[PDB]
Amino acid sequence: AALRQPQVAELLAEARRAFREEFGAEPELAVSAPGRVNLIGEHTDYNQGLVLPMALELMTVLVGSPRKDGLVSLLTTSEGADEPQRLQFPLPTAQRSLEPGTPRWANYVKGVIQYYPAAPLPGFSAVVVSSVPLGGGLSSSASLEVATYTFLQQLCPDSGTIAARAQVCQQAEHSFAGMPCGIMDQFISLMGQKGHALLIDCRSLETSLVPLSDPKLAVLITNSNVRHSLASSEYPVRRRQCEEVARALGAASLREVQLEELEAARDLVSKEGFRRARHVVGEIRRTAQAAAALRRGDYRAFGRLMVESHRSLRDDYEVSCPELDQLVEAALAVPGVYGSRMTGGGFGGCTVTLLEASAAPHAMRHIQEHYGGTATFYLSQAADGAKVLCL
Amino acid sequence: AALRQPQVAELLAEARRAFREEFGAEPELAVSAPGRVNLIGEHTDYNQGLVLPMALELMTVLVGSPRKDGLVSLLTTSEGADEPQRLQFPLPTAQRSLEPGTPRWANYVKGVIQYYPAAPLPGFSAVVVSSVPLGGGLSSSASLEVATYTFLQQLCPDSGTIAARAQVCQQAEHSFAGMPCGIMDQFISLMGQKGHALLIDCRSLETSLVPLSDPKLAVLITNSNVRHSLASSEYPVRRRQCEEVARALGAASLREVQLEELEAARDLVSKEGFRRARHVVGEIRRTAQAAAALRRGDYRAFGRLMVESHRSLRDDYEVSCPELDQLVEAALAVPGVYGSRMTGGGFGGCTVTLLEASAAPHAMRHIQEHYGGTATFYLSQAADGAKVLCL
Numbered sequence: 001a002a003l004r005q006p007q008v009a010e011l012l013a014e015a016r017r018a019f020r021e022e023f024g025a026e027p028e029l030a031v032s033a034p035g036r037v038n039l040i041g042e043h044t045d046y047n048q049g050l051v052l053p054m055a056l057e058l059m060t061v062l063v064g065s066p067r068k069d070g071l072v073s074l075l076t077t078s079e080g081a082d083e084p085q086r087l088q089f090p091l092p093t094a095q096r097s098l099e100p101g102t103p104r105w106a107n108y109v110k111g112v113i114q115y116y117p118a119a120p121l122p123g124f125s126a127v128v129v130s131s132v133p134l135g136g137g138l139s140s141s142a143s144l145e146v147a148t149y150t151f152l153q154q155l156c157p158d159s160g161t162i163a164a165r166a167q168v169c170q171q172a173e174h175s176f177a178g179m180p181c182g183i184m185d186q187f188i189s190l191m192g193q194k195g196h197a198l199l200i201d202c203r204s205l206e207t208s209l210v211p212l213s214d215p216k217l218a219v220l221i222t223n224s225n226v227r228h229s230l231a232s233s234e235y236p237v238r239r240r241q242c243e244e245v246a247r248a249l250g251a252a253s254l255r256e257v258q259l260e261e262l263e264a265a266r267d268l269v270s271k272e273g274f275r276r277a278r279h280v281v282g283e284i285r286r287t288a289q290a291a292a293a294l295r296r297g298d299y300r301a302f303g304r305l306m307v308e309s310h311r312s313l314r315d316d317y318e319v320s321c322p323e324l325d326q327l328v329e330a331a332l333a334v335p336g337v338y339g340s341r342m343t344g345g346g347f348g349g350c351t352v353t354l355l356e357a358s359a360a361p362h363a364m365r366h367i368q369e370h371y372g373g374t375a376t377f378y379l380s381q382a383a384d385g386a387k388v389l390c391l
Numbered sequence: 392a393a394l395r396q397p398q399v400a401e402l403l404a405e406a407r408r409a410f411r412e413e414f415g416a417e418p419e420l421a422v423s424a425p426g427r428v429n430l431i432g433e434h435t436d437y438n439q440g441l442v443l444p445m446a447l448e449l450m451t452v453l454v455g456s457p458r459k460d461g462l463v464s465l466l467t468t469s470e471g472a473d474e475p476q477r478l479q480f481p482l483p484t485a486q487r488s489l490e491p492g493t494p495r496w497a498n499y500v501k502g503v504i505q506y507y508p509a510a511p512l513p514g515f516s517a518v519v520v521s522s523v524p525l526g527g528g529l530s531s532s533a534s535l536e537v538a539t540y541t542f543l544q545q546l547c548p549d550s551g552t553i554a555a556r557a558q559v560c561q562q563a564e565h566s567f568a569g570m571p572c573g574i575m576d577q578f579i580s581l582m583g584q585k586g587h588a589l590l591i592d593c594r595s596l597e598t599s600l601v602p603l604s605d606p607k608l609a610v611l612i613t614n615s616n617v618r619h620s621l622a623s624s625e626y627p628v629r630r631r632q633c634e635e636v637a638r639a640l641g642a643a644s645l646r647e648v649q650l651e652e653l654e655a656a657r658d659l660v661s662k663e664g665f666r667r668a669r670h671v672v673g674e675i676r677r678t679a680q681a682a683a684a685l686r687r688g689d690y691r692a693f694g695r696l697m698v699e700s701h702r703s704l705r706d707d708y709e710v711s712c713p714e715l716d717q718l719v720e721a722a723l724a725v726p727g728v729y730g731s732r733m734t735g736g737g738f739g740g741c742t743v744t745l746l747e748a749s750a751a752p753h754a755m756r757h758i759q760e761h762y763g764g765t766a767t768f769y770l771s772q773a774a775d776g777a778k779v780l781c782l
């Protein structure tokens with residue numbers, strides 16, 4: 001049995017109740033921003049690569065009102081979130097910028113306020129609710145950053161592009177959460193359309209909408225319900241390793257390298273740098289091919305490319321873990337499954353599986369029964385991006 | 392020189408004021424939908440071809456409220472909307488549907504009601520305001536259709552994708568305006584983003600958002616302020632010729648016919664038929680080449696393709712007119728202009744001109760001086776598509 005995904009009207013109702021209770025009046029404003037699953041194109045976004053994510057119906061909802069006093073007052077019901085559930089801080093000023101602190105969850109909101117490009121931004125009271133499982137690799141943090149950005153636009157309209165908004169949320173993640181992410185998770189939370197995955201070119205920031213609206217195809221998300229500590233620590237190590245191979249080959253990024261130059265340059269780089277760069281160069285090519293394949297309705301070829309994405313992440317990039325590998329092999333053993341692999345950063349989180357709609361009940365019975373741990377499952381249709389909810 | 396383009400805040404305040412006066416109270420709901428200019432890819436959309444439009448900062452805004460009485464009550468403030476500018480009608484039933492009638496402007500709204508796919512749709516009171524010049528060839532009608540659709544979604548949510556919404560609006564234009572249009576104008580009004588052109592594959596309905604992020608480059612729109620009576624009568628005639636020469640070549644559409652194949656099948660079709668298909672088949676190739684030139688940043692190559700497109704429309708497709716031709720030749724004579732061409736259906740309306748921002752003032756003086764009639768100008772940037780506006 002797959003996990004009932006609370007609809008937007010439900011998260012919003014919980015967010016109003018906690019707000020009405022907390023601040024003594026109805027919130028004036030509200031927004032939603034989703035999480036995301038990457039179908040293929042892992043560890044390519046900070047390498048100016050290609051990724052193929054879709055937005056989920058798992059989302060973050062902000063409700064709030066402007067204040068007159070220049071303070072920010074937050075409450076989150078998110079029961080994963082670190083204590084306290086409440087936090088207040090002053091707006092940043094010419095005299096004093098905000099700094100990351102405790103609790104961790106509020107760093108995502110502080111960062112987006114700090115880099116919000118439009119002025120004058122008023123103080124606000126807000127409640128944050130989320131159905132995105134925290135640390136589960138479905139971009140909880142990007143959903144919060146983008147929900148915050150969308151809210152701030154209701155207080156104080158911005159004048160730039162949708163990429164610029166993604167880059168603000170990215171800057172918040174870099175400076176306030178110490179996590180040097182690529183643009184994928186912010187971009188998909190912002191640009192997602194119902195019935196479509198997004199081919200994102202992280203060099204040009206061109207995006208292509210790729211239909212998934214075929215009723216006999218299902219995308220299954222399996223949460224391992226594990227997050228090894230490597231998760232936080234090893235991400236910035238892989239990024240600097242890639243940047244060092246590009247610099248050693250005289251390339252602005254690995255986007256500009258192909259496997260043949262890399263083969264030929266292999267004595268300019270560590271054995272390990274070589275293997276990371278070979279994952280990225282291949283995964284860029286796989287994502288381009290997967291996108292054409294999906295557009296063609298060729299799921300088996302999409303499925304092959306997903307499994308080769310997994311192997312490359314497990315062996316060359318080394319960002320899988322026993323739990324993800326076990327979930328992937330288990331899913332591949334099931335008839336009707338085109339392919340399976342880890343999605344997001346790795347070291348835990350979720351696999352994504354493409355399978356026959358009709359094969360999905362058997363798939364969950366098998367994977368759960370064939371998992372050492374306790375899996376969770378989401379049956380996911382491609383959702384819209386961030387939007388305003390008119391209260 | 393350039394006509395001022397009201398911002399959404401100012402259109403809302405005008406619409407609220409008209410709504411308060413007309414219906415006795417503040418409206419509850421608001422939406423906006425933009426007009427468009429086609430950069431290249433003219434008369435290809437109904438040939439399952441490629442188009443490269445951008446949304447404009449010219450837009451239509453509906454404000455309104457649900458009713459209990461199953462009546463629709465409309466008022467428009469739009470400059471040359473035909474009389475009456477206010478009317479009331481009951482919602483359609485399965486028993487009886489709406490029909491196109493007087494006035495012409497309300498036909499766009501009636502059509503979208505009739506074909507709106509979700510139920511139950513309540514009655515409503517709405518005011519319609521627009522900065523898109525009625526019949527100026529910037530898709531005033533698509534902006535009204537998409538604004539109406541977006542407004543009905545606030546009364547009664549739909550559950551299809553964005554593409555289906557464009558098709559409902561297309562069907563309203565076919566049945567209620569008698570205009571057998573392609574998908575371009577509805578698609579761009581829905582899916583436009585600030586700082587992006589939209590590459591639409593009208594065969595697959597795949598779309599790519601292509602960034603316009605060179606502030607040295609500008610797009611000048613020149614309204615001829617002329618509409619010949621050919622524009623009504625002659626559009627369905629060109630569409631019919633395209634269909635005949637496709638059947639006559641045993642192809643599903645002219646999208647399936649390569650230029651070199653067409654050029655060697657001169658004897659299968661009428662000389663006229665042949666010239667129509669040569670425009671269409673060539674324009675599909677020019678559109679792909681123009682996208683690649685945008686992505687490369689080659690605005691000189693983009694400009695030359697714009698001029699080939701104009702010549703093709705003028706001589707092969709015969710949908711230009713003396714005023715458009717004078718305005719194009721006038722623009723190309725100005726230093727800093729990469730290219731110029733008629734945009735939209737033809738037989739009047741606007742040219743689009745790609746130029747150095749710094750040259751726009753000289754262009755507007757040279758073009759007006761060298762134009763037999765009275766030119767209007769817009770310097771529009773790529774705008775956002777259809778939105779909800781929270782009152």
Ligand SMILES: O=C1CCCC2=C1[C@H](c1[nH]ncc1Cl)N=C(Nc1nc3ccccc3o1)N2
Nearest residue numbers: 076078080081082104105130134135140141144
């Ligand atoms: O500490 C880390 C490192 C890994 C990434 C990470 C956090 C962290 C977190 N995980 N569990 C408890 C907490 Cl606090 N918050 C989020 N996302 C997050 N999305 C949220 C949405 C609403 C409210 C709180 C949220 O936190 N994401």
Ligand SMILES: O=C1CCCC2=C1[C@H](c1[nH]ncc1Cl)N=C(Nc1nc3ccccc3o1)N2
Nearest residue numbers: 467469471472473495496521525526531532535
């Ligand atoms: O009669 C034709 C044939 C060509 C297409 C065409 C019309 C026609 C129109 N042109 N001039 C006066 C009027 Cl009434 N209305 C619109 N668009 C239109 N967009 C509108 C937006 C808001 C209000 C009225 C509108 O009408 N478009």
Ligand SMILES: OC[C@H]1O[C@H](O)[C@H](O)[C@@H](O)[C@H]1O
Nearest residue numbers: 042043181182183184344345
């Ligand atoms: O593809 C791996 C993925 O990992 C994390 O989720 C980052 O937030 C993204 O930017 C991306 O790098």
Ligand SMILES: OC[C@H]1O[C@H](O)[C@H](O)[C@@H](O)[C@H]1O
Nearest residue numbers: 433434572573574575735736
């Ligand atoms: O490209 C010419 C253009 O003409 C009209 O404006 C139609 O609305 C569009 O569908 C398209 O066919």
Ligand code: NA
Nearest residue numbers: 368371373374
């Ligand atoms: Na188990």
Ligand code: NA
Nearest residue numbers: 759762764765
């Ligand atoms: Na003149």
